[PDB]
Each structure stands twice: as structure tokens, then as C-alpha cells.
Amino acid sequence: GLPSLKSSFVLSEDTIPGTNETVKTLLPYGSVINYYGYVKPGQAPDGLVDGNKKAYYLYVWIPAVIAEMGVRMISPTGEIGEPGDGDLVSDAFKAATPEEKSMPHWFDTWIRVERMSAIMPDQIAKAAKAKPVQGDDTYKEERHNKYNSLTRIKIPNPPKSFDDLKNIDTKKLLVRGLYRISFTTYKPGEVKGSFVASVGLLFPPGIPGVSPLIHSNPEELQKQAIAAEE
Amino acid sequence: GLPSLKSSFVLSEDTIPGTNETVKTLLPYGSVINYYGYVKPGQAPDGLVDGNKKAYYLYVWIPAVIAEMGVRMISPTGEIGEPGDGDLVSDAFKAATPEEKSMPHWFDTWIRVERMSAIMPDQIAKAAKAKPVQGDDTYKEERHNKYNSLTRIKIPNPPKSFDDLKNIDTKKLLVRGLYRISFTTYKPGEVKGSFVASVGLLFPPGIPGVSPLIHSNPEELQKQAIAAEE
């Protein structure tokens, strides 16, 4: 499967025996969903970036406050075998051929994460048509993501130790709500073909995870989030 | 730069708080070289693999006995700017345009590692012409390498604890010498354009590394190997 999606929190530091160097163990996100998708030929971009790049949007509903979110874009995917307990696989991906899924199209992803104006699930489709809200949980951008690197949305002044998130003033945590992930790339690449976007959520110590809901279609996301909170 | 190149040895095992799951942190190779290369459009394959798959060769000089060697293939690379001392950048790579270095061409690498018949650096060029010798340090194949996974050459019965490699019988270690790495891919991908092959060496506890030397041109490798031992 995919490599482990790591948060920014250093779970442990260990010196390499004999040397002086340490290697940091990162704490993985506790709640991770991998969205396998497929951008079809002829699919109009959702918007423009940098005056000359076609951007596509993925929507994420984060159902509760979090200490951090990480987003990773990998492409292409090839065929994937049996989806795992945290894998979403879009209809467009299922309809694509193995050859189609195995053709590469881009390698460096420019990612933006913007919070949208929905407080509850039934405002999702509407909010996705409005401007983003105008901290990382309002606006975050990483113009280069290559070799499986992540874009992370973090709290303002994260402590070194994960365990120190205990008793953190909750007003510092990132808000529940709808986040739009924009992804694009640099010529001569293009956003086309298969990809997997892994979204990981980190909750403070002692707080059980809840999974993000993810979809490229805001109406479908809205349907799912409303069902999830009946 | 590139992600850390990890050996198969587990350095630390840390409990994720509140679960029965463990995140294993791997020991990085102590001596790593990153070879940045570029395969030209219409470049004749160095060889054939699996009957008719176009294969390309990289030659590696491993100057002392080792516990493990790791090979990772990443492509494309994009522009890298200023190379570090762990980086080797070929003339074909240097001559390529940034656009050229940024077009992806394949994503799943079939890797073979074969030991050649050279005992000393001045035998490398001639050995590269002769047939491979006929353990992992004689022959190793991994037909699928994606999402930056590695192909590893290991001693017959590696212990779990790196520290248990202390006092290992040197006769079990992988031998100093010349190793040929063959890489190919599957349609619809093709081997073309930029790539970085990272080769990492792991030595038993208490042994300072030597760097591996790598090149696609065996005559150039020979020159560099001779110089490095004079």
C-alpha cells in the first residue's frame, strides 16, 4: 500500500549507535483516509492558479476540532488491489482502465488548503460555491510537494512533544468545518489521470479519532456529512 | 532534498499512545550516494530484460564488505539546483532542460541487482563487459518498486536488532565488488527522462562507512574507483 502518513510531531529521537546523529520518529496521523481518484481527459479545471495553471478541488469535511491535518498527493497510482478499511475509491477511478491508471502525468503538486463557509453538513454544497473564508486552518499553501512530501495544517505554536498537547487551550485547535484542497502542477506536467490524496487527522492525546469525509463533488460530500450526523 | 534512505533494520519500536500498535523506525543507511541521471529520447537500451523489456544499467562499486545495500529509484526529479557531496549528477542530467527534467515518464521500476567479476577497481571496465557472476549479493530482483520503495540486498539471515550484527561472521557479509543495477518498467510507462538512483550501504556496528561509487559508464566508474583508493 501507501507509505505511512506522518504528522509533524516527533514521537521519539534515537541516536544512531556509535555516531552522534539522532533520527526522529514521527507520530503518524491517527485518522487517515486515502482518496483514490481520476481526473478525466477533457475535465474542465475547477479554477486557475498562478494565472496559467489548471487547479482541481477536493473537499474535506472535518467533523471535530483537531491538532493537525496532513495532505499528501501521490500520482499516478496504477492498479491498487482490494481497497483497505480507510480507502475511498471514486467512480471515475473504478471506471478507468489499468493502462489509464498506470500512465504518469505530473510529479510536483502545488497544494492549497482553504477553509470554506460551512458550519454544518447541510451548508456544504452552498459553501463550496462561495468564496473561501478570509492561521493554517484558514489558508495554507505549499507550492512544491514531490517525492511523497506533505502539506500540513498546523496549530500556531505547536509544542515539541505530542503529549504536551494535553490541556492545550482548545481555542488553539483547528476548527471543525469544510476545507477545500486545490491541487495543480507546473508545465510540462498536467493534472490528469489517477492519483491518491491521503488526508490525515491528528487529535490531542486521549481523544478518539473521527475520520474525515472526502469528495470531489460537494453535493455528494454534503449528502455524506448529513447522513453522518443525523 | 530527497527522503531519508532507510535500511531494513529496526532502530526503535515506539508504542502509539492508547493503542496496541507500534511504529517501527528504521535505521538509515550510513553511507548514501544519490545519482541524478537522464535517459535521452530514443536512447538505445543497455540491455534486454524479461525477453524484450528495455533495460538500463547503473554500475556500483562497493569498496568494503557490508551488512546491506539499498537501491531506490525515483523519477522524474525536476530541477535540483546545487548538488551536495552525497550527490552525483551525470552529464546527460546536466545538459537536460528544466522542462526536460520535469516531464514524468514511468512510475513502477523493475529492478535487478547482479554482482560482476571485478575484485579491484582497475578491473571494473573489463568486468562490466563480461557476463554477471552466477545469495542477494550475487543476484536479486524486485519486479515492482513504486511510491519510492526500495530494492534491498541483504545477508542470508539478518537479525532484527542492528546491534546483533556485532561479531557477525564476516563470511556472511555481502562482498566488496562491482554490482550492476538493471532498471526497466511496464507499458504504458517507459524509461526516459530524469531519475535519481539512491544507493545506500549499511556497515555492521562500529565500522565507519565508505561511500559507494556509482555511474552508468563503467569506464568512468573505474576511473573514480581507482582514484578513491589510491
mmCIF file of N, CA and C in Angstrom, chain B residues 89-177:
data_model
loop_
_atom_site.group_PDB
_atom_site.id
_atom_site.type_symbol
_atom_site.label_atom_id
_atom_site.label_comp_id
_atom_site.label_asym_id
_atom_site.label_seq_id
_atom_site.Cartn_x
_atom_site.Cartn_y
_atom_site.Cartn_z
ATOM 1 N N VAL B 89 25.833 13.975 -10.237
ATOM 2 C CA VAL B 89 24.954 14.453 -11.303
ATOM 3 C C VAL B 89 25.627 14.200 -12.653
ATOM 4 N N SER B 90 24.994 13.397 -13.510
ATOM 5 C CA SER B 90 25.639 12.966 -14.747
ATOM 6 C C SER B 90 25.654 14.105 -15.797
ATOM 7 N N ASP B 91 26.478 13.943 -16.837
ATOM 8 C CA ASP B 91 26.479 14.909 -17.903
ATOM 9 C C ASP B 91 25.142 14.981 -18.639
ATOM 10 N N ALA B 92 24.475 13.836 -18.856
ATOM 11 C CA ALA B 92 23.177 13.843 -19.532
ATOM 12 C C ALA B 92 22.138 14.616 -18.713
ATOM 13 N N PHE B 93 22.224 14.498 -17.383
ATOM 14 C CA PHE B 93 21.341 15.230 -16.465
ATOM 15 C C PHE B 93 21.624 16.728 -16.552
ATOM 16 N N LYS B 94 22.901 17.097 -16.437
ATOM 17 C CA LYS B 94 23.289 18.492 -16.530
ATOM 18 C C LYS B 94 22.843 19.144 -17.831
ATOM 19 N N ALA B 95 22.902 18.411 -18.942
ATOM 20 C CA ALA B 95 22.593 19.014 -20.251
ATOM 21 C C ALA B 95 21.088 19.160 -20.490
ATOM 22 N N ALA B 96 20.281 18.419 -19.730
ATOM 23 C CA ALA B 96 18.830 18.465 -19.848
ATOM 24 C C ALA B 96 18.225 19.794 -19.389
ATOM 25 N N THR B 97 17.174 20.221 -20.065
ATOM 26 C CA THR B 97 16.470 21.421 -19.651
ATOM 27 C C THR B 97 15.566 21.165 -18.446
ATOM 28 N N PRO B 98 15.236 22.223 -17.706
ATOM 29 C CA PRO B 98 14.362 22.040 -16.553
ATOM 30 C C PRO B 98 13.029 21.398 -16.902
ATOM 31 N N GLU B 99 12.412 21.878 -17.974
ATOM 32 C CA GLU B 99 11.235 21.214 -18.525
ATOM 33 C C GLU B 99 11.497 19.735 -18.794
ATOM 34 N N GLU B 100 12.682 19.434 -19.299
ATOM 35 C CA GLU B 100 13.006 18.059 -19.636
ATOM 36 C C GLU B 100 13.113 17.191 -18.394
ATOM 37 N N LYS B 101 13.616 17.790 -17.327
ATOM 38 C CA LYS B 101 13.826 17.072 -16.082
ATOM 39 C C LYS B 101 12.525 16.905 -15.311
ATOM 40 N N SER B 102 11.472 17.588 -15.771
ATOM 41 C CA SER B 102 10.203 17.674 -15.060
ATOM 42 C C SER B 102 9.065 16.918 -15.737
ATOM 43 N N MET B 103 9.290 16.312 -16.886
ATOM 44 C CA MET B 103 8.235 15.524 -17.517
ATOM 45 C C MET B 103 8.283 14.094 -16.953
ATOM 46 N N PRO B 104 7.162 13.601 -16.396
ATOM 47 C CA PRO B 104 7.239 12.215 -15.914
ATOM 48 C C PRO B 104 7.088 11.226 -17.071
ATOM 49 N N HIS B 105 7.670 10.035 -16.934
ATOM 50 C CA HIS B 105 7.642 9.021 -17.992
ATOM 51 C C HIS B 105 7.286 7.613 -17.510
ATOM 52 N N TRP B 106 7.684 7.286 -16.289
ATOM 53 C CA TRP B 106 7.295 5.982 -15.733
ATOM 54 C C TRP B 106 7.114 6.065 -14.228
ATOM 55 N N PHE B 107 6.474 5.072 -13.633
ATOM 56 C CA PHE B 107 6.291 5.166 -12.197
ATOM 57 C C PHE B 107 6.565 3.884 -11.379
ATOM 58 N N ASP B 108 6.692 2.751 -12.050
ATOM 59 C CA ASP B 108 6.941 1.473 -11.383
ATOM 60 C C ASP B 108 8.207 0.856 -11.999
ATOM 61 N N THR B 109 9.258 0.702 -11.196
ATOM 62 C CA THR B 109 10.538 0.227 -11.696
ATOM 63 C C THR B 109 10.786 -1.226 -11.331
ATOM 64 N N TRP B 110 11.088 -2.015 -12.350
ATOM 65 C CA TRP B 110 11.553 -3.378 -12.177
ATOM 66 C C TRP B 110 13.062 -3.259 -11.982
ATOM 67 N N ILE B 111 13.558 -3.716 -10.835
ATOM 68 C CA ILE B 111 14.984 -3.608 -10.536
ATOM 69 C C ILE B 111 15.647 -4.984 -10.393
ATOM 70 N N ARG B 112 16.805 -5.162 -11.030
ATOM 71 C CA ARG B 112 17.672 -6.329 -10.788
ATOM 72 C C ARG B 112 19.045 -5.884 -10.354
ATOM 73 N N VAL B 113 19.615 -6.579 -9.369
ATOM 74 C CA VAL B 113 20.987 -6.318 -8.959
ATOM 75 C C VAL B 113 21.829 -7.574 -9.142
ATOM 76 N N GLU B 114 22.907 -7.454 -9.917
ATOM 77 C CA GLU B 114 23.772 -8.588 -10.227
ATOM 78 C C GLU B 114 25.242 -8.268 -9.964
ATOM 79 N N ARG B 115 25.926 -9.132 -9.226
ATOM 80 C CA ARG B 115 27.349 -8.930 -8.973
ATOM 81 C C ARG B 115 28.158 -9.278 -10.227
ATOM 82 N N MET B 116 29.210 -8.508 -10.505
ATOM 83 C CA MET B 116 30.083 -8.747 -11.677
ATOM 84 C C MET B 116 31.442 -9.263 -11.227
ATOM 85 N N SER B 117 32.297 -9.690 -12.163
ATOM 86 C CA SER B 117 33.577 -10.305 -11.797
ATOM 87 C C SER B 117 34.708 -9.308 -11.776
ATOM 88 N N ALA B 118 34.669 -8.372 -10.836
ATOM 89 C CA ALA B 118 35.792 -7.469 -10.599
ATOM 90 C C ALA B 118 36.197 -7.542 -9.127
ATOM 91 N N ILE B 119 37.480 -7.768 -8.871
ATOM 92 C CA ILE B 119 37.976 -7.833 -7.497
ATOM 93 C C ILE B 119 38.555 -6.486 -7.070
ATOM 94 N N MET B 120 39.163 -5.771 -8.019
ATOM 95 C CA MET B 120 39.787 -4.469 -7.766
ATOM 96 C C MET B 120 39.261 -3.416 -8.738
ATOM 97 N N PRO B 121 39.320 -2.142 -8.327
ATOM 98 C CA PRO B 121 38.761 -1.054 -9.133
ATOM 99 C C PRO B 121 39.268 -1.034 -10.581
ATOM 100 N N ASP B 122 40.532 -1.387 -10.817
ATOM 101 C CA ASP B 122 41.060 -1.352 -12.186
ATOM 102 C C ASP B 122 40.546 -2.495 -13.067
ATOM 103 N N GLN B 123 39.667 -3.328 -12.517
ATOM 104 C CA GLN B 123 39.062 -4.436 -13.259
ATOM 105 C C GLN B 123 37.618 -4.137 -13.677
ATOM 106 N N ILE B 124 37.122 -2.975 -13.265
ATOM 107 C CA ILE B 124 35.716 -2.642 -13.413
ATOM 108 C C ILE B 124 35.237 -2.565 -14.859
ATOM 109 N N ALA B 125 35.973 -1.837 -15.701
ATOM 110 C CA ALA B 125 35.616 -1.653 -17.107
ATOM 111 C C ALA B 125 35.499 -2.989 -17.840
ATOM 112 N N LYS B 126 36.518 -3.831 -17.685
ATOM 113 C CA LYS B 126 36.525 -5.135 -18.332
ATOM 114 C C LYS B 126 35.443 -6.039 -17.742
ATOM 115 N N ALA B 127 35.326 -6.067 -16.417
ATOM 116 C CA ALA B 127 34.283 -6.860 -15.768
ATOM 117 C C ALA B 127 32.881 -6.495 -16.265
ATOM 118 N N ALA B 128 32.655 -5.211 -16.532
ATOM 119 C CA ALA B 128 31.340 -4.748 -16.974
ATOM 120 C C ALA B 128 30.941 -5.337 -18.319
ATOM 121 N N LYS B 129 31.937 -5.762 -19.097
ATOM 122 C CA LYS B 129 31.734 -6.356 -20.413
ATOM 123 C C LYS B 129 31.421 -7.848 -20.324
ATOM 124 N N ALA B 130 32.000 -8.516 -19.329
ATOM 125 C CA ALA B 130 31.779 -9.945 -19.132
ATOM 126 C C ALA B 130 30.401 -10.213 -18.520
ATOM 127 N N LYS B 131 29.993 -11.479 -18.559
ATOM 128 C CA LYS B 131 28.696 -11.888 -18.028
ATOM 129 C C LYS B 131 28.676 -11.707 -16.513
ATOM 130 N N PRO B 132 27.485 -11.517 -15.935
ATOM 131 C CA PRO B 132 27.404 -11.455 -14.486
ATOM 132 C C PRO B 132 27.832 -12.767 -13.853
ATOM 133 N N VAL B 133 28.289 -12.685 -12.614
ATOM 134 C CA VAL B 133 28.624 -13.871 -11.850
ATOM 135 C C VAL B 133 27.385 -14.723 -11.656
ATOM 136 N N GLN B 134 27.567 -16.023 -11.491
ATOM 137 C CA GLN B 134 26.416 -16.880 -11.178
ATOM 138 C C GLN B 134 26.797 -18.091 -10.314
ATOM 139 N N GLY B 135 22.553 -16.189 -3.174
ATOM 140 C CA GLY B 135 22.607 -15.039 -2.268
ATOM 141 C C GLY B 135 22.217 -13.703 -2.909
ATOM 142 N N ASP B 136 21.810 -12.745 -2.082
ATOM 143 C CA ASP B 136 21.399 -11.429 -2.578
ATOM 144 C C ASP B 136 22.588 -10.688 -3.221
ATOM 145 N N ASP B 137 23.804 -10.970 -2.749
ATOM 146 C CA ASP B 137 24.978 -10.303 -3.303
ATOM 147 C C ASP B 137 25.519 -10.998 -4.552
ATOM 148 N N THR B 138 24.728 -11.897 -5.122
ATOM 149 C CA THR B 138 25.059 -12.440 -6.442
ATOM 150 C C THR B 138 23.955 -12.057 -7.415
ATOM 151 N N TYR B 139 22.720 -12.118 -6.930
ATOM 152 C CA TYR B 139 21.556 -11.896 -7.767
ATOM 153 C C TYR B 139 20.342 -11.526 -6.915
ATOM 154 N N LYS B 140 19.703 -10.415 -7.243
ATOM 155 C CA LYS B 140 18.498 -10.021 -6.553
ATOM 156 C C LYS B 140 17.587 -9.295 -7.523
ATOM 157 N N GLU B 141 16.312 -9.661 -7.529
ATOM 158 C CA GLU B 141 15.342 -8.981 -8.388
ATOM 159 C C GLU B 141 14.126 -8.507 -7.591
ATOM 160 N N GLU B 142 13.651 -7.284 -7.862
ATOM 161 C CA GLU B 142 12.330 -6.828 -7.398
ATOM 162 C C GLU B 142 11.571 -6.232 -8.584
ATOM 163 N N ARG B 143 10.490 -6.891 -8.983
ATOM 164 C CA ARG B 143 9.799 -6.564 -10.218
ATOM 165 C C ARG B 143 8.941 -5.309 -10.114
ATOM 166 N N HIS B 144 8.640 -4.904 -8.884
ATOM 167 C CA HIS B 144 7.808 -3.726 -8.663
ATOM 168 C C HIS B 144 8.377 -2.841 -7.566
ATOM 169 N N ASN B 145 8.675 -1.600 -7.927
ATOM 170 C CA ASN B 145 9.128 -0.587 -6.987
ATOM 171 C C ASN B 145 8.344 0.669 -7.318
ATOM 172 N N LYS B 146 7.408 1.030 -6.443
ATOM 173 C CA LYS B 146 6.631 2.247 -6.619
ATOM 174 C C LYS B 146 6.481 3.055 -5.332
ATOM 175 N N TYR B 147 6.033 4.298 -5.493
ATOM 176 C CA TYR B 147 5.867 5.204 -4.380
ATOM 177 C C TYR B 147 7.200 5.296 -3.618
ATOM 178 N N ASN B 148 8.306 5.220 -4.354
ATOM 179 C CA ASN B 148 9.650 5.368 -3.789
ATOM 180 C C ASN B 148 10.111 4.217 -2.862
ATOM 181 N N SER B 149 9.539 3.038 -3.029
ATOM 182 C CA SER B 149 10.008 1.892 -2.273
ATOM 183 C C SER B 149 11.391 1.416 -2.775
ATOM 184 N N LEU B 150 12.062 0.611 -1.957
ATOM 185 C CA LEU B 150 13.429 0.230 -2.234
ATOM 186 C C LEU B 150 13.528 -1.222 -2.654
ATOM 187 N N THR B 151 14.608 -1.542 -3.363
ATOM 188 C CA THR B 151 15.047 -2.923 -3.531
ATOM 189 C C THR B 151 16.278 -3.079 -2.637
ATOM 190 N N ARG B 152 16.310 -4.144 -1.838
ATOM 191 C CA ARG B 152 17.407 -4.326 -0.893
ATOM 192 C C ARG B 152 18.162 -5.632 -1.083
ATOM 193 N N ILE B 153 19.484 -5.558 -0.988
ATOM 194 C CA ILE B 153 20.320 -6.754 -0.983
ATOM 195 C C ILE B 153 20.742 -7.001 0.458
ATOM 196 N N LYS B 154 20.384 -8.168 0.984
ATOM 197 C CA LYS B 154 20.569 -8.482 2.407
ATOM 198 C C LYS B 154 21.437 -9.723 2.617
ATOM 199 N N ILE B 155 22.072 -9.832 3.788
ATOM 200 C CA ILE B 155 22.759 -11.074 4.179
ATOM 201 C C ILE B 155 21.719 -12.167 4.412
ATOM 202 N N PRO B 156 22.126 -13.447 4.318
ATOM 203 C CA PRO B 156 21.179 -14.568 4.379
ATOM 204 C C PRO B 156 20.193 -14.560 5.545
ATOM 205 N N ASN B 157 20.639 -14.261 6.754
ATOM 206 C CA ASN B 157 19.685 -14.359 7.871
ATOM 207 C C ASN B 157 19.786 -13.151 8.760
ATOM 208 N N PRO B 158 19.252 -12.010 8.305
ATOM 209 C CA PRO B 158 19.551 -10.824 9.093
ATOM 210 C C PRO B 158 18.838 -10.892 10.444
ATOM 211 N N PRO B 159 19.514 -10.472 11.521
ATOM 212 C CA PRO B 159 18.839 -10.362 12.803
ATOM 213 C C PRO B 159 17.923 -9.138 12.785
ATOM 214 N N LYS B 160 17.014 -9.051 13.749
ATOM 215 C CA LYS B 160 16.106 -7.908 13.831
ATOM 216 C C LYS B 160 16.837 -6.698 14.403
ATOM 217 N N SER B 161 17.652 -6.917 15.423
ATOM 218 C CA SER B 161 18.369 -5.818 16.034
ATOM 219 C C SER B 161 19.653 -5.548 15.257
ATOM 220 N N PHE B 162 19.770 -4.352 14.692
ATOM 221 C CA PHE B 162 21.012 -3.943 14.055
ATOM 222 C C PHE B 162 22.235 -4.236 14.935
ATOM 223 N N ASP B 163 22.109 -4.006 16.243
ATOM 224 C CA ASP B 163 23.225 -4.227 17.148
ATOM 225 C C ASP B 163 23.666 -5.693 17.191
ATOM 226 N N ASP B 164 22.783 -6.594 16.795
ATOM 227 C CA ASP B 164 23.155 -8.002 16.788
ATOM 228 C C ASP B 164 24.079 -8.341 15.632
ATOM 229 N N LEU B 165 24.329 -7.373 14.758
ATOM 230 C CA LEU B 165 25.305 -7.550 13.686
ATOM 231 C C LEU B 165 26.732 -7.428 14.205
ATOM 232 N N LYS B 166 26.882 -7.015 15.460
ATOM 233 C CA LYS B 166 28.183 -7.055 16.101
ATOM 234 C C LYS B 166 28.663 -8.490 16.090
ATOM 235 N N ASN B 167 29.954 -8.670 15.870
ATOM 236 C CA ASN B 167 30.539 -10.004 15.929
ATOM 237 C C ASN B 167 29.977 -10.967 14.879
ATOM 238 N N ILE B 168 29.258 -10.448 13.887
ATOM 239 C CA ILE B 168 28.825 -11.307 12.789
ATOM 240 C C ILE B 168 30.042 -11.922 12.062
ATOM 241 N N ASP B 169 29.894 -13.164 11.610
ATOM 242 C CA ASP B 169 30.888 -13.829 10.776
ATOM 243 C C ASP B 169 31.027 -13.062 9.460
ATOM 244 N N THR B 170 32.218 -12.525 9.197
ATOM 245 C CA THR B 170 32.403 -11.660 8.025
ATOM 246 C C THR B 170 32.112 -12.424 6.753
ATOM 247 N N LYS B 171 32.278 -13.736 6.799
ATOM 248 C CA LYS B 171 31.965 -14.558 5.646
ATOM 249 C C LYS B 171 30.483 -14.473 5.248
ATOM 250 N N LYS B 172 29.619 -14.043 6.166
ATOM 251 C CA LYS B 172 28.210 -13.870 5.844
ATOM 252 C C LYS B 172 27.916 -12.502 5.196
ATOM 253 N N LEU B 173 28.803 -11.538 5.404
ATOM 254 C CA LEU B 173 28.557 -10.191 4.887
ATOM 255 C C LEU B 173 28.621 -10.180 3.364
ATOM 256 N N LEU B 174 28.005 -9.178 2.755
ATOM 257 C CA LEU B 174 27.992 -9.080 1.302
ATOM 258 C C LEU B 174 29.355 -8.591 0.852
ATOM 259 N N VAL B 175 29.823 -9.081 -0.289
ATOM 260 C CA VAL B 175 31.213 -8.865 -0.655
ATOM 261 C C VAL B 175 31.471 -7.517 -1.318
ATOM 262 N N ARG B 176 32.663 -7.005 -1.066
ATOM 263 C CA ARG B 176 33.201 -5.853 -1.761
ATOM 264 C C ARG B 176 33.222 -6.208 -3.245
ATOM 265 N N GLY B 177 32.826 -5.283 -4.115
ATOM 266 C CA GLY B 177 33.000 -5.529 -5.542
ATOM 267 C C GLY B 177 32.091 -4.692 -6.420
#
